[PDB]
mmCIF file of N, CA and C in Angstrom:
data_model
loop_
_atom_site.group_PDB
_atom_site.id
_atom_site.type_symbol
_atom_site.label_atom_id
_atom_site.label_comp_id
_atom_site.label_asym_id
_atom_site.label_seq_id
_atom_site.Cartn_x
_atom_site.Cartn_y
_atom_site.Cartn_z
ATOM 1 N N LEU E 834 0.829 -1.202 0.000
ATOM 2 C CA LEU E 834 0.000 0.000 0.000
ATOM 3 C C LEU E 834 0.870 1.261 0.000
ATOM 4 N N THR E 835 1.613 1.463 -1.088
ATOM 5 C CA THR E 835 2.528 2.591 -1.201
ATOM 6 C C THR E 835 2.123 3.470 -2.374
ATOM 7 N N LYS E 836 2.598 4.720 -2.366
ATOM 8 C CA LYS E 836 2.132 5.677 -3.365
ATOM 9 C C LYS E 836 2.404 5.174 -4.775
ATOM 10 N N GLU E 837 3.664 4.843 -5.062
ATOM 11 C CA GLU E 837 4.052 4.455 -6.413
ATOM 12 C C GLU E 837 3.398 3.143 -6.822
ATOM 13 N N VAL E 838 3.414 2.155 -5.927
ATOM 14 C CA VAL E 838 2.854 0.847 -6.252
ATOM 15 C C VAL E 838 1.364 0.971 -6.530
ATOM 16 N N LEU E 839 0.656 1.724 -5.689
ATOM 17 C CA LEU E 839 -0.782 1.867 -5.868
ATOM 18 C C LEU E 839 -1.108 2.696 -7.103
ATOM 19 N N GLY E 840 -0.304 3.718 -7.398
ATOM 20 C CA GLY E 840 -0.501 4.445 -8.641
ATOM 21 C C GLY E 840 -0.325 3.559 -9.857
ATOM 22 N N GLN E 841 0.732 2.746 -9.864
ATOM 23 C CA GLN E 841 0.944 1.835 -10.981
ATOM 24 C C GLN E 841 -0.186 0.825 -11.080
ATOM 25 N N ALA E 842 -0.655 0.314 -9.941
ATOM 26 C CA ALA E 842 -1.759 -0.637 -9.971
ATOM 27 C C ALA E 842 -3.031 0.013 -10.497
ATOM 28 N N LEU E 843 -3.289 1.262 -10.108
ATOM 29 C CA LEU E 843 -4.455 1.972 -10.620
ATOM 30 C C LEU E 843 -4.357 2.164 -12.129
ATOM 31 N N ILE E 844 -3.182 2.575 -12.613
ATOM 32 C CA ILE E 844 -2.982 2.711 -14.053
ATOM 33 C C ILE E 844 -3.181 1.362 -14.722
ATOM 34 N N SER E 845 -2.667 0.308 -14.090
ATOM 35 C CA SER E 845 -2.811 -1.035 -14.623
ATOM 36 C C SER E 845 -4.274 -1.417 -14.727
ATOM 37 N N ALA E 846 -5.070 -1.117 -13.699
ATOM 38 C CA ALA E 846 -6.492 -1.445 -13.741
ATOM 39 C C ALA E 846 -7.193 -0.658 -14.839
ATOM 40 N N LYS E 847 -6.833 0.616 -15.000
ATOM 41 C CA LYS E 847 -7.417 1.404 -16.079
ATOM 42 C C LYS E 847 -7.092 0.758 -17.417
ATOM 43 N N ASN E 848 -5.822 0.420 -17.615
ATOM 44 C CA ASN E 848 -5.429 -0.246 -18.843
ATOM 45 C C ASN E 848 -6.108 -1.601 -18.966
ATOM 46 N N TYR E 849 -6.317 -2.302 -17.851
ATOM 47 C CA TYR E 849 -7.041 -3.567 -17.887
ATOM 48 C C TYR E 849 -8.438 -3.375 -18.442
ATOM 49 N N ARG E 850 -9.151 -2.370 -17.944
ATOM 50 C CA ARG E 850 -10.511 -2.159 -18.420
ATOM 51 C C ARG E 850 -10.497 -1.762 -19.889
ATOM 52 N N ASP E 851 -9.564 -0.889 -20.280
ATOM 53 C CA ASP E 851 -9.477 -0.493 -21.682
ATOM 54 C C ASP E 851 -9.159 -1.689 -22.570
ATOM 55 N N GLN E 852 -8.177 -2.497 -22.173
ATOM 56 C CA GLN E 852 -7.849 -3.686 -22.941
ATOM 57 C C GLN E 852 -9.032 -4.628 -22.972
ATOM 58 N N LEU E 853 -9.792 -4.690 -21.880
ATOM 59 C CA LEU E 853 -10.972 -5.537 -21.854
ATOM 60 C C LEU E 853 -11.991 -5.054 -22.870
ATOM 61 N N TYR E 854 -12.191 -3.739 -22.966
ATOM 62 C CA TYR E 854 -13.114 -3.245 -23.978
ATOM 63 C C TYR E 854 -12.606 -3.587 -25.369
ATOM 64 N N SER E 855 -11.304 -3.404 -25.610
ATOM 65 C CA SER E 855 -10.752 -3.756 -26.917
ATOM 66 C C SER E 855 -10.893 -5.245 -27.214
ATOM 67 N N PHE E 856 -10.606 -6.095 -26.229
ATOM 68 C CA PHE E 856 -10.760 -7.534 -26.402
ATOM 69 C C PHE E 856 -12.216 -7.895 -26.642
ATOM 70 N N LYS E 857 -13.124 -7.247 -25.920
ATOM 71 C CA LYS E 857 -14.545 -7.454 -26.146
ATOM 72 C C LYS E 857 -14.897 -7.072 -27.573
ATOM 73 N N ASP E 858 -14.364 -5.946 -28.044
ATOM 74 C CA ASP E 858 -14.614 -5.511 -29.411
ATOM 75 C C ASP E 858 -14.138 -6.575 -30.385
ATOM 76 N N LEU E 859 -12.922 -7.080 -30.177
ATOM 77 C CA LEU E 859 -12.405 -8.134 -31.042
ATOM 78 C C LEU E 859 -13.323 -9.343 -30.971
ATOM 79 N N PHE E 860 -13.815 -9.640 -29.769
ATOM 80 C CA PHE E 860 -14.715 -10.764 -29.555
ATOM 81 C C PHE E 860 -16.004 -10.567 -30.328
ATOM 82 N N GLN E 861 -16.519 -9.345 -30.310
ATOM 83 C CA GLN E 861 -17.733 -9.027 -31.039
ATOM 84 C C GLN E 861 -17.502 -9.133 -32.532
ATOM 85 N N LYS E 862 -16.348 -8.666 -32.999
ATOM 86 C CA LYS E 862 -16.013 -8.851 -34.400
ATOM 87 C C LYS E 862 -15.969 -10.328 -34.763
ATOM 88 N N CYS E 863 -15.348 -11.156 -33.916
ATOM 89 C CA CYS E 863 -15.308 -12.588 -34.199
ATOM 90 C C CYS E 863 -16.698 -13.203 -34.206
ATOM 91 N N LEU E 864 -17.534 -12.829 -33.235
ATOM 92 C CA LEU E 864 -18.904 -13.330 -33.186
ATOM 93 C C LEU E 864 -19.679 -12.957 -34.440
ATOM 94 N N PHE E 865 -19.640 -11.677 -34.799
ATOM 95 C CA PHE E 865 -20.366 -11.197 -35.962
ATOM 96 C C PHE E 865 -19.857 -11.881 -37.215
ATOM 97 N N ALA E 866 -18.538 -12.016 -37.347
ATOM 98 C CA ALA E 866 -17.975 -12.667 -38.518
ATOM 99 C C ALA E 866 -18.392 -14.130 -38.543
ATOM 100 N N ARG E 867 -18.463 -14.763 -37.370
ATOM 101 C CA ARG E 867 -18.921 -16.145 -37.293
ATOM 102 C C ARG E 867 -20.354 -16.266 -37.788
ATOM 103 N N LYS E 868 -21.214 -15.333 -37.376
ATOM 104 C CA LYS E 868 -22.601 -15.388 -37.820
ATOM 105 C C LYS E 868 -22.690 -15.093 -39.309
ATOM 106 N N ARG E 869 -21.829 -14.194 -39.783
ATOM 107 C CA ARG E 869 -21.690 -13.961 -41.209
ATOM 108 C C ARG E 869 -21.304 -15.229 -41.942
ATOM 109 N N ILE E 870 -20.305 -15.950 -41.438
ATOM 110 C CA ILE E 870 -19.856 -17.177 -42.083
ATOM 111 C C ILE E 870 -20.966 -18.216 -42.072
ATOM 112 N N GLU E 871 -21.729 -18.277 -40.984
ATOM 113 C CA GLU E 871 -22.857 -19.198 -40.932
ATOM 114 C C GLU E 871 -23.833 -18.889 -42.056
ATOM 115 N N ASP E 872 -24.220 -17.616 -42.151
ATOM 116 C CA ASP E 872 -25.152 -17.193 -43.184
ATOM 117 C C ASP E 872 -24.555 -17.407 -44.568
ATOM 118 N N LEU E 873 -23.276 -17.098 -44.718
ATOM 119 C CA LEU E 873 -22.639 -17.256 -46.011
ATOM 120 C C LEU E 873 -22.580 -18.711 -46.443
ATOM 121 N N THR E 874 -22.262 -19.642 -45.541
ATOM 122 C CA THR E 874 -22.236 -21.040 -45.961
ATOM 123 C C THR E 874 -23.621 -21.611 -46.268
ATOM 124 N N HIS E 875 -24.642 -21.282 -45.461
ATOM 125 C CA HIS E 875 -25.979 -21.757 -45.835
ATOM 126 C C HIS E 875 -26.398 -21.163 -47.178
ATOM 127 N N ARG E 876 -26.190 -19.853 -47.336
ATOM 128 C CA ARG E 876 -26.527 -19.167 -48.574
ATOM 129 C C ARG E 876 -25.719 -19.698 -49.747
ATOM 130 N N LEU E 877 -24.433 -19.975 -49.542
ATOM 131 C CA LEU E 877 -23.598 -20.503 -50.611
ATOM 132 C C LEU E 877 -24.077 -21.873 -51.073
ATOM 133 N N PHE E 878 -24.483 -22.744 -50.141
ATOM 134 C CA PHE E 878 -25.037 -24.032 -50.562
ATOM 135 C C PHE E 878 -26.321 -23.823 -51.361
ATOM 136 N N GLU E 879 -27.190 -22.939 -50.865
ATOM 137 C CA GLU E 879 -28.428 -22.617 -51.573
ATOM 138 C C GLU E 879 -28.107 -22.113 -52.968
ATOM 139 N N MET E 880 -27.079 -21.277 -53.058
ATOM 140 C CA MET E 880 -26.715 -20.618 -54.295
ATOM 141 C C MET E 880 -26.145 -21.628 -55.275
ATOM 142 N N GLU E 881 -25.437 -22.633 -54.760
ATOM 143 C CA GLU E 881 -25.000 -23.728 -55.616
ATOM 144 C C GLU E 881 -26.199 -24.481 -56.175
ATOM 145 N N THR E 882 -27.205 -24.725 -55.332
ATOM 146 C CA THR E 882 -28.430 -25.364 -55.807
ATOM 147 C C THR E 882 -29.099 -24.547 -56.910
ATOM 148 N N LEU W 834 -18.016 24.700 -8.989
ATOM 149 C CA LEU W 834 -16.657 24.222 -8.736
ATOM 150 C C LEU W 834 -16.409 23.835 -7.273
ATOM 151 N N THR W 835 -17.114 22.816 -6.776
ATOM 152 C CA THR W 835 -16.930 22.423 -5.381
ATOM 153 C C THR W 835 -16.476 20.971 -5.314
ATOM 154 N N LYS W 836 -15.875 20.590 -4.183
ATOM 155 C CA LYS W 836 -15.275 19.261 -4.085
ATOM 156 C C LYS W 836 -16.296 18.160 -4.334
ATOM 157 N N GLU W 837 -17.414 18.189 -3.605
ATOM 158 C CA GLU W 837 -18.396 17.114 -3.691
ATOM 159 C C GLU W 837 -18.952 17.069 -5.098
ATOM 160 N N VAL W 838 -19.247 18.237 -5.653
ATOM 161 C CA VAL W 838 -19.792 18.311 -6.997
ATOM 162 C C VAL W 838 -18.787 17.721 -7.973
ATOM 163 N N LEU W 839 -17.496 18.017 -7.799
ATOM 164 C CA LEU W 839 -16.499 17.498 -8.731
ATOM 165 C C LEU W 839 -16.362 15.986 -8.599
ATOM 166 N N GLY W 840 -16.469 15.460 -7.380
ATOM 167 C CA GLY W 840 -16.492 14.014 -7.226
ATOM 168 C C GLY W 840 -17.679 13.411 -7.950
ATOM 169 N N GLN W 841 -18.843 14.038 -7.784
ATOM 170 C CA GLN W 841 -20.052 13.583 -8.454
ATOM 171 C C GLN W 841 -19.899 13.678 -9.962
ATOM 172 N N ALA W 842 -19.272 14.751 -10.439
ATOM 173 C CA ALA W 842 -19.049 14.914 -11.870
ATOM 174 C C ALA W 842 -18.121 13.834 -12.398
ATOM 175 N N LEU W 843 -17.090 13.483 -11.630
ATOM 176 C CA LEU W 843 -16.206 12.408 -12.056
ATOM 177 C C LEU W 843 -16.985 11.108 -12.155
ATOM 178 N N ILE W 844 -17.813 10.828 -11.150
ATOM 179 C CA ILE W 844 -18.657 9.639 -11.201
ATOM 180 C C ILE W 844 -19.596 9.710 -12.395
ATOM 181 N N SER W 845 -20.157 10.892 -12.651
ATOM 182 C CA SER W 845 -21.064 11.071 -13.776
ATOM 183 C C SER W 845 -20.359 10.774 -15.085
ATOM 184 N N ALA W 846 -19.134 11.272 -15.246
ATOM 185 C CA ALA W 846 -18.380 11.021 -16.468
ATOM 186 C C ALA W 846 -18.067 9.540 -16.598
ATOM 187 N N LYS W 847 -17.722 8.901 -15.482
ATOM 188 C CA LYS W 847 -17.466 7.470 -15.511
ATOM 189 C C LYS W 847 -18.710 6.733 -15.984
ATOM 190 N N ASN W 848 -19.860 7.062 -15.400
ATOM 191 C CA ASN W 848 -21.105 6.442 -15.823
ATOM 192 C C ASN W 848 -21.412 6.789 -17.271
ATOM 193 N N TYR W 849 -21.064 8.002 -17.696
ATOM 194 C CA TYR W 849 -21.236 8.394 -19.088
ATOM 195 C C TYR W 849 -20.473 7.476 -20.018
ATOM 196 N N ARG W 850 -19.214 7.221 -19.695
ATOM 197 C CA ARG W 850 -18.397 6.378 -20.554
ATOM 198 C C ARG W 850 -18.936 4.951 -20.565
ATOM 199 N N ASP W 851 -19.333 4.436 -19.397
ATOM 200 C CA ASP W 851 -19.905 3.094 -19.337
ATOM 201 C C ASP W 851 -21.201 3.009 -20.137
ATOM 202 N N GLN W 852 -22.090 3.992 -19.965
ATOM 203 C CA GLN W 852 -23.328 4.008 -20.728
ATOM 204 C C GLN W 852 -23.012 4.103 -22.204
ATOM 205 N N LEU W 853 -21.954 4.833 -22.543
ATOM 206 C CA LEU W 853 -21.524 4.947 -23.924
ATOM 207 C C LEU W 853 -21.104 3.588 -24.441
ATOM 208 N N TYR W 854 -20.396 2.812 -23.622
ATOM 209 C CA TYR W 854 -20.011 1.470 -24.037
ATOM 210 C C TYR W 854 -21.243 0.603 -24.275
ATOM 211 N N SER W 855 -22.221 0.678 -23.378
ATOM 212 C CA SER W 855 -23.442 -0.088 -23.605
ATOM 213 C C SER W 855 -24.146 0.371 -24.877
ATOM 214 N N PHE W 856 -24.212 1.689 -25.068
ATOM 215 C CA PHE W 856 -24.830 2.262 -26.253
ATOM 216 C C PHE W 856 -24.087 1.869 -27.522
ATOM 217 N N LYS W 857 -22.751 1.869 -27.486
ATOM 218 C CA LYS W 857 -21.982 1.411 -28.637
ATOM 219 C C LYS W 857 -22.292 -0.034 -28.951
ATOM 220 N N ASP W 858 -22.348 -0.869 -27.919
ATOM 221 C CA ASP W 858 -22.639 -2.270 -28.162
ATOM 222 C C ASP W 858 -23.983 -2.421 -28.844
ATOM 223 N N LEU W 859 -25.009 -1.757 -28.315
ATOM 224 C CA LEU W 859 -26.314 -1.841 -28.954
ATOM 225 C C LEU W 859 -26.241 -1.294 -30.376
ATOM 226 N N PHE W 860 -25.501 -0.196 -30.562
ATOM 227 C CA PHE W 860 -25.359 0.424 -31.875
ATOM 228 C C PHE W 860 -24.663 -0.470 -32.881
ATOM 229 N N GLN W 861 -23.616 -1.170 -32.469
ATOM 230 C CA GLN W 861 -22.933 -2.043 -33.410
ATOM 231 C C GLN W 861 -23.843 -3.176 -33.831
ATOM 232 N N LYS W 862 -24.608 -3.719 -32.887
ATOM 233 C CA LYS W 862 -25.604 -4.705 -33.259
ATOM 234 C C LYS W 862 -26.569 -4.093 -34.260
ATOM 235 N N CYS W 863 -26.996 -2.853 -34.000
ATOM 236 C CA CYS W 863 -27.887 -2.147 -34.917
ATOM 237 C C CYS W 863 -27.255 -1.895 -36.279
ATOM 238 N N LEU W 864 -25.980 -1.515 -36.321
ATOM 239 C CA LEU W 864 -25.291 -1.314 -37.591
ATOM 240 C C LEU W 864 -25.322 -2.600 -38.393
ATOM 241 N N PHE W 865 -24.939 -3.697 -37.745
ATOM 242 C CA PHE W 865 -24.917 -4.980 -38.424
ATOM 243 C C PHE W 865 -26.321 -5.317 -38.888
ATOM 244 N N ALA W 866 -27.316 -5.076 -38.029
ATOM 245 C CA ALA W 866 -28.702 -5.365 -38.374
ATOM 246 C C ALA W 866 -29.172 -4.483 -39.525
ATOM 247 N N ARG W 867 -28.734 -3.223 -39.564
ATOM 248 C CA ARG W 867 -29.085 -2.358 -40.684
ATOM 249 C C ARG W 867 -28.533 -2.931 -41.974
ATOM 250 N N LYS W 868 -27.287 -3.398 -41.935
ATOM 251 C CA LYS W 868 -26.694 -3.985 -43.129
ATOM 252 C C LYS W 868 -27.394 -5.296 -43.458
ATOM 253 N N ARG W 869 -27.808 -6.017 -42.417
ATOM 254 C CA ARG W 869 -28.649 -7.194 -42.575
ATOM 255 C C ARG W 869 -29.940 -6.852 -43.294
ATOM 256 N N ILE W 870 -30.618 -5.789 -42.863
ATOM 257 C CA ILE W 870 -31.866 -5.390 -43.500
ATOM 258 C C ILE W 870 -31.593 -4.989 -44.936
ATOM 259 N N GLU W 871 -30.458 -4.335 -45.175
ATOM 260 C CA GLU W 871 -30.090 -3.990 -46.540
ATOM 261 C C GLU W 871 -29.999 -5.257 -47.374
ATOM 262 N N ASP W 872 -29.262 -6.250 -46.872
ATOM 263 C CA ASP W 872 -29.102 -7.519 -47.572
ATOM 264 C C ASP W 872 -30.437 -8.237 -47.724
ATOM 265 N N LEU W 873 -31.272 -8.207 -46.684
ATOM 266 C CA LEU W 873 -32.561 -8.883 -46.747
ATOM 267 C C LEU W 873 -33.441 -8.252 -47.806
ATOM 268 N N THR W 874 -33.437 -6.925 -47.883
ATOM 269 C CA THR W 874 -34.202 -6.243 -48.915
ATOM 270 C C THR W 874 -33.600 -6.522 -50.279
ATOM 271 N N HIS W 875 -32.271 -6.606 -50.340
ATOM 272 C CA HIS W 875 -31.619 -6.963 -51.587
ATOM 273 C C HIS W 875 -32.082 -8.331 -52.057
ATOM 274 N N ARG W 876 -32.080 -9.292 -51.141
ATOM 275 C CA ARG W 876 -32.540 -10.632 -51.454
ATOM 276 C C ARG W 876 -34.011 -10.626 -51.815
ATOM 277 N N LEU W 877 -34.812 -9.834 -51.104
ATOM 278 C CA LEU W 877 -36.234 -9.773 -51.402
ATOM 279 C C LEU W 877 -36.512 -9.224 -52.797
ATOM 280 N N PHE W 878 -35.801 -8.171 -53.230
ATOM 281 C CA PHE W 878 -36.032 -7.741 -54.610
ATOM 282 C C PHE W 878 -35.585 -8.842 -55.559
ATOM 283 N N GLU W 879 -34.427 -9.453 -55.283
ATOM 284 C CA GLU W 879 -33.957 -10.539 -56.141
ATOM 285 C C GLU W 879 -34.999 -11.644 -56.226
ATOM 286 N N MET W 880 -35.594 -12.007 -55.092
ATOM 287 C CA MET W 880 -36.526 -13.125 -55.075
ATOM 288 C C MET W 880 -37.814 -12.739 -55.776
ATOM 289 N N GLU W 881 -38.210 -11.473 -55.661
ATOM 290 C CA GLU W 881 -39.342 -10.990 -56.435
ATOM 291 C C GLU W 881 -39.036 -11.067 -57.924
ATOM 292 N N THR W 882 -37.813 -10.692 -58.307
ATOM 293 C CA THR W 882 -37.381 -10.822 -59.695
ATOM 294 C C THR W 882 -37.450 -12.270 -60.155
#
């Protein structure tokens, strides 16, 4: 519980939350792209038919 | 410009950013859904054709 250590930990937590939002964003991109791929493969099979 | 008010304002800004994150999440779903509706209408004209 020291000034420098707690300041660094606070900065670390801020960066943790920011990185978490960025990781969540990447996660959302992966999810959306996955749903896109799902739709694209069903549609592509239909389109082959 | 008072201490308590500034603490409250900091909390307000924090809640603002969090609400913004929730709003962005809903918005990105909406963006994707808008493009979905675009594609669905595209498919619907095609299917009418």
